[PDB]
Design a protein around this ligand. Structure first.
Ligand SMILES: CCN(C(=O)c1cc(F)ccc1Oc1nncnc1N1CCC2(C1)CN([C@H](CCCN(C)CCOC)C(C)C)C2)C(C)C
Ligand code: NA
Length: 484
């Protein structure tokens, strides 16, 4: 049951028609997330999941339009009928409102009870069909939910907040960290309740307090994102996955996203959203929008956003930057940024379901850095002659030992140790000996009338003068890395 203001915006014959729809909804008081998420789901289906166009199907129709050179020729965008999307929309509303009874739960001064929210979660929980033995992609949107009843972990949380909007509940909102989503609610908006899975132990109906308390990356020591309705649109925008298969991405779904991120950027709703500022910078690198800022400019906004709004406890802000440096073959600035990545992670404790960030750290230490160094060593006969890199490298390994400290699980093992020695070896003994490790002479500075380094970790302190030697001790370091 949409408004006539919404209905006249259709049909969506192009990306610009979608971008237009999204702009109009942002200007309204409560943006219709259900509508918007369906539109993203619809278009993505044809643009990525099932590109083949049917024969004897009057319901659907496509719009020809020139494609850019070198490719040239035309491209056929799926025209969103109002008749199609109106039906889908009304099924969801009828499903949710048919499933629940709002007049039972007396929201005394608009107070949605924890009782009430657990029901809405359970309505989404009982109707879904989970892809267990396969990792299905493109199962994020309410299109996927209404059509196939398949949703990824994060999409379940989003689906609840959709239903909460479908029942007029303004106070229920999507919470998320860098790799997990739940719901945030209350009068002052400080309740937490799990509404999904992660990878595992099924725990819905609980607060996220124990997660915060144990200093795990998945919950960010409390410094996670609380979304207003406008930020929830930026999430569904970010959830667009253009990949047809492993190595190919759809150009239309790129442009669609890249355009839609800029719109939000202008309206100001990427201000408290670091990961979105990185994704737009990643897109700018691939295809730079004409008359717009640079990736670096956009990456540094995401860093400051995390520093100001999120207590400088986010990790990906720095990794976004180092990757750009890495793909540009600027070896000094990349390690520097990976050392800054270590600065944040040192003050965590590695718990079991912080799986995703380990994988990223592992790849830097054991694939990307040695790749860059193998390039650098071949390029030499320089960043290897430049002693500033080795100070950054040691501080990157420093934070991972410190990360590991205070955990129930070990981080480092023999597999890691090989590449440390390989990377250590890439710098000459003349270069590495110049670095000075000190405790500190005097604290502070005052207004009156070689390069320094400092380890926080026990392990790097344990091998202080082993790292600085003339000839490398490959056997001894491997052992001293691992400990109880
Ligand atoms: C990406 C899907 N997604 C989640 O995985 C997710 C789901 C949740 F529940 C919570 C958070 C979540 O993470 C993100 N939340 N908001 C925005 N983006 C998220 N992504 C997570 C992975 C991501 C962004 C990309 N990662 C970076 C790599 C970028 C590499 N690029 C593409 C290369 C460019 O080369 C030209 C970092 C490793 C640096 C961070 C959300 C959007 C539904
Ligand atoms: Na630690």
């Amino acid at each position: 049951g949409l408004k006539a203001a919404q209905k006249t915006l259709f049909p969506l014959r192009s990306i610009d028609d979608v971008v237009r729809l999204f702009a109009a909804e942002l200007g309204r008081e409560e943006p219709d997330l259900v509508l918007l998420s369906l539109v993203l789901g619809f278009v993505e289906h044809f643009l990525a999941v099932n590109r083949v166009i049917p024969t004897n199907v009057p319901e659907l129709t496509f719009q020809p339009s020139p494609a850019p050179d070198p490719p040239g020729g035309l491209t056929y965008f799926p025209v969103a009928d109002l008749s199609i999307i109106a039906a889908l929309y009304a099924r969801f509303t009828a499903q949710i409102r048919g499933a629940v009874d709002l007049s039972l739960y007396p929201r005394e001064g608009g107070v949605s009870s924890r009782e009430l929210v657990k029901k809405v979660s359970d309505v989404i929980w009982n109707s879904l069909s989970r892809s267990y033995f396969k990792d299905r992609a493109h199962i994020q949107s309410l299109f996927s939910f209404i059509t196939g009843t398949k949703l990824d972990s994060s999409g379940v949380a989003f689906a609840v907040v959709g239903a909460c909007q479908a029942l007029g509940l303004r106070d229920v909102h999507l919470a998320l960290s860098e790799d997990h989503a739940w719901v945030v609610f209350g009068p002052n908006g400080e309740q937490t309740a799990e509404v999904t899975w992660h990878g595992n132990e099924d725990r819905r109906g609980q607060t996220v307090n124990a997660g915060v308390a144990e200093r795990s990356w998945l919950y960010l020591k409390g410094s996670y994102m609380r979304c207003d309705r406008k930020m929830e649109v930026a999430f569904m925008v970010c959830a667009i996955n253009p990949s047809i298969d492993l190595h190919t991405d759809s150009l239309e779904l790129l442009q669609l996203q890249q355009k839609l991120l800029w719109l939000l950027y202008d309206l100001g709703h990427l201000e408290r959203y670091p990961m979105a500022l990185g994704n737009l910078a990643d897109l700018e690198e691939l295809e730079p929008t004409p008359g717009r800022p640079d990736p670096l400019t956009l990456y540094h906004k995401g860093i400051a956003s995390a520093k100001t709004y999120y207590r400088d406890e986010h990790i990906y802000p720095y990794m976004y930057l180092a990757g750009y440096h890495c793909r540009n073959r600027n070896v000094r600035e990349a390690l520097q940024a990976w050392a800054d990545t270590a600065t944040v992670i040192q003050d965590y404790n590695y718990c079991r379901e912080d799986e995703e960030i380990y994988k990223e750290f592992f790849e830097v230490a054991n694939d990307v850095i040695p790749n860059l160094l193998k390039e650098a060593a071949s390029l030499l006969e320089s960043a290897l002659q430049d002693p500033e890199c080795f100070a950054h490298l040691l501080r990157f390994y420093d934070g991972i030992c410190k990360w590991e400290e205070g955990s129930p699980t070990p981080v480092l093992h023999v597999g890691w140790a090989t590449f440390l020695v390989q990377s250590l070896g890439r710098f000459e003994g003349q270069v590495r000996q110049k670095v000075r490790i000190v405790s500190g002479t005097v604290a502070g500075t005052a207004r009156g009338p070689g390069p320094v380094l400092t380890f926080q970790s026990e392990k790097m302190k344990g091998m202080k003068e082993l790292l600085v030697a003339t000839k490398i001790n490959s056997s001894a370091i491997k052992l001293q890395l691992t400990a109880q």
